[PDB]
Symmetry: C2
Subunit: 403 residues, 2 copies
Amino acid sequence: KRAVITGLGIVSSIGNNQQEVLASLREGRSGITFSQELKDSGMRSHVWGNVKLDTTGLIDRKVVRFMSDASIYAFLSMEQAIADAGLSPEAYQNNPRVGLIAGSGGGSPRFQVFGADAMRGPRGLKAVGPYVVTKAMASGVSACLATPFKIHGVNYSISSACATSAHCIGNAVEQIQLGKQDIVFAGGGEELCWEMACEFDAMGALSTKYNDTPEKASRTYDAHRDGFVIAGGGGMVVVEELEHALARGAHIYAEIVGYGATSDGADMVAPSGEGAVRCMKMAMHGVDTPIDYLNSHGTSTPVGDVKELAAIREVFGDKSPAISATKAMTGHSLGAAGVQEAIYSLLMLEHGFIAPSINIEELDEQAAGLNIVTETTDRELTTVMSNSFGFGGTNATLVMRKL
Amino acid sequence: KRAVITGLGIVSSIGNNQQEVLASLREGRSGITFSQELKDSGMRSHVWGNVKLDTTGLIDRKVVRFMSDASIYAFLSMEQAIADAGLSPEAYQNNPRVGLIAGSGGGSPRFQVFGADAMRGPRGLKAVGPYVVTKAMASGVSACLATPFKIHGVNYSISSACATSAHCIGNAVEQIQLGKQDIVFAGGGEELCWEMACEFDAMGALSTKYNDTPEKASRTYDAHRDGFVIAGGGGMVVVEELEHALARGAHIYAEIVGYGATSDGADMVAPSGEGAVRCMKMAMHGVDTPIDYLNSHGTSTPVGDVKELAAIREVFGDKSPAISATKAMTGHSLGAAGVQEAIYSLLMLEHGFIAPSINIEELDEQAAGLNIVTETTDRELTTVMSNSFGFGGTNATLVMRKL
């Protein structure tokens, strides 16, 4: 019935494992860099939240033939999580009580496009090859990790744009509550490419006025923000039943004490405060300890940023928690944003500190009811909340508490 | 706690609604036709499981501008499900206890490719336009239906290849069991295009030897089958909490009394018997009634078809149910296959007949001692089972029973 996180792994723009991420979080270090690729694309946005790591050879030759970047990032993250959780092969492999729920927001635009361009050339089918489905299909991330890691429980992906990996974690918690699984690896991944990025630029969602100073592009809550900074990477956490975790001497980060999942049912791409309010409240049902820190969705967009603050004001009124948007550092990894940010939240809980909300040169007026921390502050945290509100009006929020 | 289907909608290759689909299933009619588009793309497979319908002015300009075919098909299917259920806006809209769980196996390869093609042209961003994300993103089907239908409950998509809409339904059932929702629209959609189809041809998964006689290409269990026939379309069922249904005088087709979801954790694209066996068994746990009819996954592939048989025999033995693969008629709609086939199963339950397993000019040796119904046969059915085993070793099976 109770769900705890007994392990975590992450490959991101500010770190290649939890240690580099930590140091990065405490330092308010940007993972954003200039992109020749995007510029060469014709996009007006030339800033990236790229993973600094040559993934070549990092995965078995026969295994990686099926994967796309999103899958590669999730795989490496899962390798970490397994080691971190102290899970031996005989403890999670060929085990009907061990499952996998991980996905991506966009699958693999790069390999869908690759398949098309190839089919339309002199070589036709021969130039396409037999690995484009597993790479391009929406369930790529889950399909590509379940087979190699020998998962026997649930196996599928959940997608919900900026909230996909958060919904992945919440669903994992439900499997534990339903007594269907003892362990569920939850998370997701996302490739970084002009193929997909141009789509967001086309709808004016990405930053375009700070290409000369990449590290200043992502500026959640700043009066001059102008869209988010796309990014890629992976993340994965080990969701485990309390008793099973205690029974084997597992190290527990936090227990998932709250999980909200609602729908706006109003506007596409644009967020409605109501909806987010219900999501947070739903995550708070039963949680009687205060929320010490809130890791906002805050993607650095004019509308979205102040729409989330407004929701927070409703849910908390005058007891508003310390807030910070780590996206000003990391960028928006879409499908990987949910689990990655849960991981940052878990790290701040474990090491007692609040990561800073960087690049706020002029706090947005609509943000007067402060407590948005713009400086790394050491504090003993007990209960933290992470918000994920994606396109299509799909919301998710998780509440993690120290045991 | 208990979940029932109180409404259904479907847009498929053998019928644009449940009355048309009932006719084709009784008749044993094929929805497969020759495709100029496929042939012209350069594919070796030129057979289609196309949706015979002009959707041109069926969806409001403001709403369909964000959709791709998969979304359009799922939307029309929900519309029918909504009407066939007895539901009106004031009862399903702006209601936190009503949700949506629907997705697709491949999202929209057509619009991902279109964006890339459009970006590379001379106009660039202005040629891509602002609607490619919602069309191409993996969560397109759910995002595109939640907003227009003003959904307030859960809102997200699940992908698992040939099993995505089945997992979508099973997840809907769990939300009811968890007491989180009263009604959950579950299903999915899938576009039909060379862009995606060529990917499956490239891995030799599609039929290629029967292009001259399209209706004979899909021949599950036949000794000369040679891959599946790709198809597209949508499906959607209304999963509802029993007491809620009864209280409003809803029409109940059946109750989902079983839901299995397992993983092979062995081979990519290739199915392992054991995973399926566990899935079916997990689905029949607690069902005190025998399975009267089994709607197999049977996609018409040499390996896959017989592996499922062996799995079934391992499961039942000398208790084998009547079997039939409706894919020999409809083709493989991938992400839409799960709900569509659940719908066929529900119709056979509701109308007391078993749809035929067509095109078996020569029964495969492996399908020996089994009841493969090859003729439309009238029978009073009580409990039916539907199998969905997708690429990546992800399995799902649903057991529906009369109340």
